[PDB]
Design an enzyme around this catalytic site. Structure first.
Site, PDB file in Angstrom:
ATOM      1  N   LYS A  49      46.131  -1.885  56.747  1.00 60.16           N
ATOM      2  CA  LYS A  49      44.688  -1.693  56.552  1.00 60.16           C
ATOM      3  C   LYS A  49      44.322  -1.878  55.061  1.00 60.16           C
ATOM      4  O   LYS A  49      44.998  -1.296  54.217  1.00 60.16           O
ATOM      5  CB  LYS A  49      44.271  -0.281  57.028  1.00 60.16           C
ATOM      6  CG  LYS A  49      42.782   0.058  56.859  1.00 60.16           C
ATOM      7  CD  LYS A  49      42.517   1.531  57.163  1.00 60.16           C
ATOM      8  CE  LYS A  49      41.075   1.926  56.956  1.00 60.16           C
ATOM      9  NZ  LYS A  49      40.788   3.261  57.546  1.00 60.16           N
ATOM     10  N   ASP A 137      36.724  13.230  64.269  1.00 62.03           N
ATOM     11  CA  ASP A 137      36.347  11.918  64.790  1.00 62.03           C
ATOM     12  C   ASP A 137      37.197  11.490  65.986  1.00 62.03           C
ATOM     13  O   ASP A 137      37.589  10.323  66.087  1.00 62.03           O
ATOM     14  CB  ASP A 137      36.318  10.830  63.689  1.00 62.03           C
ATOM     15  CG  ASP A 137      35.561   9.544  64.044  1.00 62.03           C
ATOM     16  OD1 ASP A 137      35.780   8.519  63.363  1.00 62.03           O
ATOM     17  OD2 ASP A 137      34.771   9.561  65.022  1.00 62.03           O
TER      18      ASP A 137
HETATM   19  C1  LIG Z   1      38.073  -4.219  63.729  1.00 63.99           C
HETATM   20  O1  LIG Z   1      38.787  -3.780  64.894  1.00 63.99           O
HETATM   21  C2  LIG Z   1      40.162  -4.197  64.973  1.00 63.99           C
HETATM   22  C3  LIG Z   1      41.100  -3.021  64.605  1.00 63.99           C
HETATM   23  C4  LIG Z   1      42.567  -3.429  64.808  1.00 63.99           C
HETATM   24  N1  LIG Z   1      42.772  -3.840  66.219  1.00 63.99           N
HETATM   25  C5  LIG Z   1      44.118  -3.874  66.602  1.00 63.99           C
HETATM   26  N2  LIG Z   1      44.523  -4.764  67.523  1.00 63.99           N
HETATM   27  C6  LIG Z   1      45.796  -4.833  67.915  1.00 63.99           C
HETATM   28  C7  LIG Z   1      46.713  -3.945  67.350  1.00 63.99           C
HETATM   29  C8  LIG Z   1      46.285  -2.981  66.411  1.00 63.99           C
HETATM   30  N3  LIG Z   1      47.239  -2.113  65.846  1.00 63.99           N
HETATM   31  C9  LIG Z   1      47.005  -0.997  65.019  1.00 63.99           C
HETATM   32  C10 LIG Z   1      45.736  -0.702  64.529  1.00 63.99           C
HETATM   33  C11 LIG Z   1      45.549   0.438  63.744  1.00 63.99           C
HETATM   34  N4  LIG Z   1      44.447   0.993  63.154  1.00 63.99           N
HETATM   35  C12 LIG Z   1      44.844   2.140  62.539  1.00 63.99           C
HETATM   36  C13 LIG Z   1      43.854   2.884  61.749  1.00 63.99           C
HETATM   37  C14 LIG Z   1      42.647   2.316  61.283  1.00 63.99           C
HETATM   38  N5  LIG Z   1      42.010   3.221  60.606  1.00 63.99           N
HETATM   39  N6  LIG Z   1      42.780   4.393  60.617  1.00 63.99           N
HETATM   40  C15 LIG Z   1      43.907   4.179  61.312  1.00 63.99           C
HETATM   41  N7  LIG Z   1      46.147   2.333  62.684  1.00 63.99           N
HETATM   42  C16 LIG Z   1      46.640   1.297  63.431  1.00 63.99           C
HETATM   43  C17 LIG Z   1      47.885   0.928  63.954  1.00 63.99           C
HETATM   44  N8  LIG Z   1      48.021  -0.184  64.690  1.00 63.99           N
HETATM   45  N9  LIG Z   1      44.984  -2.992  66.072  1.00 63.99           N
HETATM   46  C18 LIG Z   1      41.970  -5.041  66.572  1.00 63.99           C
HETATM   47  C19 LIG Z   1      40.466  -4.769  66.379  1.00 63.99           C
END
Ligand SMILES: COC1CCN(c2nccc(Nc3cc4nc(-c5cn[nH]c5)[nH]c4cn3)n2)CC1
Length: 297
Positions: A49, A137
């Site tokens: 991120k 949240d």
């Molecule tokens: C803008 O929207 C996007 C966010 C990411 N999304 C996603 N697709 C496949 C795998 C994955 N894996 C993933 C995402 C994560 N997002 C977090 C996170 C984000 N903010 N706080 C924690 N931790 C994560 C761990 N793996 N994510 C696709 C749409």
């Protein structure tokens, strides 16, 4: 209070390879990648991120909270990379968020999967309660899917020690956030699952929500829900926060139900349904790939 002896791991840019972008928005961008530590002979599938002093404070606040958690149903921070931008390195949750998963796979989502997810969310939530952490949240968008059989709570940065439609009435009216206000959000999350991703109070503007809740109005009984399941959702939405169930009681309630899923959720074509398993063909160069859950240090 007890000293937070959690380790903050600083990871070199050269230690990981960004494969592609998963999504963008009003924060920066989330990437898919691989982390190849030192000379460890391991490839860890990761989510990365990602310049203003104000925005770095917020991302480092989330890093703080995320590095302080360790539970099978909570997303832990693997590390941070101190580039010009500053980025969080997390475990890749290959199937994305639960909200989009239930929308994309409604036809193959059976009662066993729905109830098991409910148990897993309550377990994660109860862990955050043990660690004296208030999420602030919790929603189906903030529950990620490692495998269809394994989900985890994520998205800290609001977590302490606005999403109106997921909020307890005290939170809307007085800005009071407790573990019992997380229970309200839990009820809404369950409702999102049971409706296969319906938007809560669709069309109603956030400013009307407070007054709607005050009148005694709640989210409706989803068609697949028995009074048994809806009764739990409704209890999460009581005015008296102490009258709401405790997360340890939600684990118990949903577990009892997950033992006889068809008695608690009525889904046309249940049991005949099947979601991808780690015992299926091409479920996963990927030679020395280890999932973060198996990469300890
Ligand atoms: C803008 O929207 C996007 C966010 C990411 N999304 C996603 N697709 C496949 C795998 C994955 N894996 C993933 C995402 C994560 N997002 C977090 C996170 C984000 N903010 N706080 C924690 N931790 C994560 C761990 N793996 N994510 C696709 C749409």
């Amino acid at each position: 209070e007890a000293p937070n002896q959690a380790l903050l791991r600083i990871l070199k840019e050269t230690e990981f390879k960004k494969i592609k972008v998963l999504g963008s928005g009003a924060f920066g961008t989330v990437y898919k990648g691989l982390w190849i530590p030192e000379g460890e002979k391991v490839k860890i599938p990761v989510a990365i991120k990602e310049t203003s002093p104000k925005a770095n404070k917020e991302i480092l606040d989330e890093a703080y909270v995320m590095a302080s958690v360790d539970n099978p149903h909570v997303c832990r921070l693997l590390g941070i990379c101190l580039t010009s931008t500053v980025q969080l390195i997390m475990q890749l949750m290959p199937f994305g968020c639960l909200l989009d998963y239930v929308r994309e796979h409604k036809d193959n989502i059976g009662s066993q999967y729905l109830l098991n997810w409910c148990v897993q969310i309550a377990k994660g939530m109860n862990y955050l309660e043990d660690r004296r952490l208030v999420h602030r949240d919790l929603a189906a968008r903030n529950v990620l899917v490692k495998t269809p059989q394994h989900v985890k709570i994520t998205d800290f940065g609001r977590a302490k020690l606005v999403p109106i439609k997921w909020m307890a009435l005290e939170s809307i009216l007085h800005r009071i956030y407790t573990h019992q206000s997380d229970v309200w959000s839990y009820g809404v999350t369950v409702w999102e699952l049971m409706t296969f991703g319906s938007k809560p109070y669709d069309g109603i503007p956030a400013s009307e929500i407070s007054s709607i809740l005050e009148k005694g109005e709640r989210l409706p009984q989803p068609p697949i829900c028995t009074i048994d399941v809806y009764m739990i959702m409704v209890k999460c939405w009581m005015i008296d926060a102490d009258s709401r169930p405790k997360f340890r009681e939600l684990i118990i309630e949903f577990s009892k139900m997950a033992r006889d899923p068809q008695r608690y959720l009525v889904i046309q074509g249940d049991e005949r349904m099947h979601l991808p398993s780690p015992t299926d063909s091409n479920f996963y160069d990927m030679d020395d790939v280890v999932d973060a859950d198996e990469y300890l240090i």
